[PDB]
């Protein structure tokens, strides 16, 4: 198999914008012997965010566009992406639970964030009774990270938004007041700026 080449590959894919080839190059790597070099730990985080993002972005536009015959055409299109989307979270969400979270320091909150992230993603998507279980599933996953942090920064944000709430925001924000970190914060403020 040779991990240190499938990494060089995962890198080389991003060095050329192909995010699926990338996200994939990492899957092979995560599904090797876990505990990922903070760099490796990174590539996967992003590759995957792009990929599911791409689809997440698109899901957004069409759901609205939809809202007659032309619309069954939309749902049929939504349906199709909701699918690759699901395929991506589920794909990664798994890796996490069956490889990533169990093989960790700081990472443990990182992953736990991400884990709750992806169900959040799936949560946006769900419909029938499935939804409730996915939502709760994310929370416990997120809530678990909120407490373990006590990066952590980024987390506070995402958990924060996940609620829409603000209450949790100002709190984890306010305390922080005491370049990278900066950025994130701006956003949470900005979030309240919104709410």
């Amino acid at each position: 198999m040779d991990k240190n080449e499938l990494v060089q590959k995962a890198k080389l894919a991003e060095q050329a914008e192909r995010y699926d080839d990338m996200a994939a190059c990492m899957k092979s790597v995560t599904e090797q012997g876990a505990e990922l070099s903070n760099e490796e730990r990174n590539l996967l985080s992003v590759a995957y965010k792009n990929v599911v993002g791409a689809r997440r972005s698109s899901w957004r536009v069409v759901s609205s566009i939809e809202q007659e015959k032309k619309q069954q055409m939309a749902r049929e299109y939504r349906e199709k992406i909701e699918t690759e989307l699901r395929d991506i979270c589920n794909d990664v969400l798994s890796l996490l639970e069956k490889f990533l979270i169990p093989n960790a320091a700081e990472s443990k909150v990182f992953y736990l964030k991400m884990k709750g992230d992806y169900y959040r993603y799936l949560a946006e998507v769900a419909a029938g009774d499935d939804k409730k279980g996915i939502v709760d599933q994310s929370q416990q996953a997120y809530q678990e990270a909120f407490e373990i942090s006590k990066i952590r920064l980024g987390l506070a944000l995402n958990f924060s938004v996940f609620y829409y709430a603000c209450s949790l925001a100002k709190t984890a924000f306010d305390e922080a007041i005491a370049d990278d970190s900066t950025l994130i914060m701006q956003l949470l403020r900005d979030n309240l700026t919104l709410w």
């Binding site: 990174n42 985080s45 992003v46 944000l157 994130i184 919104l194 709410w195």
Partner: peptide, 7 residues
Amino acid sequence: RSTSTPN
């Protein structure tokens, strides 16, 4: 609305 991160 809102979110979320970057890389």
